[PDB]
Ligand binder design. Structure first.
Ligand SMILES: CC(C)c1nc(CN(C)C(=O)N[C@H](C(=O)N[C@@H](Cc2ccccc2)C[C@H](O)[C@H](Cc2ccccc2)NC(=O)OCc2cncs2)C(C)C)cs1
Lengths: 99, 99
């Protein structure tokens, strides 16, 4: 699709057997989601850093559907003020900025 | 242009007689820049919110050139870890997300 930016670009995703809402965020390197239970192995990752770091669980090669595009990528699971799709998954869906 | 998202979408802007670099950030409602001196009237604005608010100066109807597109919009001037072009100016340049 083509998404204009008059409102926040919130989209529906399908992950770990759930439908969630998340923000398409070109300002974020990584994808961070809260309250999803993902199977298999993970390793801890420190993110943020200003004022301290936040520890999250890094899951690799996660299948995720974003607007009906089935892709694979890293998902960080942990506390976040809002669910964020970052550049790592936007590249996978072939999402670009255009003007 | 078409900007892919494998790297951070940093672009050159012209503002307040200066060339600056800023991040095209679809996760940000507003545009926040530091170390720019803008003429005329402003009013304080509280932004952020998590852990406290940050006070910045809100300038309206500022002429700004973003990748050669001359546009007009609100610029918040104040401390920011990185210069951010938010949705308010992306709409002005006609910037969309596409996949
Ligand atoms: C909480 C939720 C309901 C939201 N609040 C908002 C309102 N706010 C505050 C903003 O629009 N904020 C803007 C902003 O930066 N956007 C933030 C929104 C936000 C708000 C509150 C708490 C946490 C994040 C989200 C932005 O993408 C920020 C801005 C930024 C980017 C790079 C470097 C420095 C700074 N950046 C990031 O999210 O980077 C985090 C990364 C994660 N993985 C790699 S980088 C301002 C700078 C203009 C939007 S969505």
């Amino acid at each position: 699709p083509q998404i204009t930016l008059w409102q926040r670009p919130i989209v529906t995703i399908k992950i770990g057997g759930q439908l969630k809402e998340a923000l398409l965020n070109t300002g974020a390197d990584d994808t961070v989601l809260e309250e999803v239970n993902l199977p298999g192995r993970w390793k801890p990752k420190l993110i943020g850093g200003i004022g301290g770091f936040v520890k999250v669980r890094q899951y690799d090669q996660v299948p995720i559907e974003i607007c009906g595009h089935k892709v694979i990528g890293t998902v960080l699971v942990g506390p976040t003020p809002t669910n964020v799709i970052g550049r790592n998954l936007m590249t996978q869906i072939g999402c670009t900025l255009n003007f």
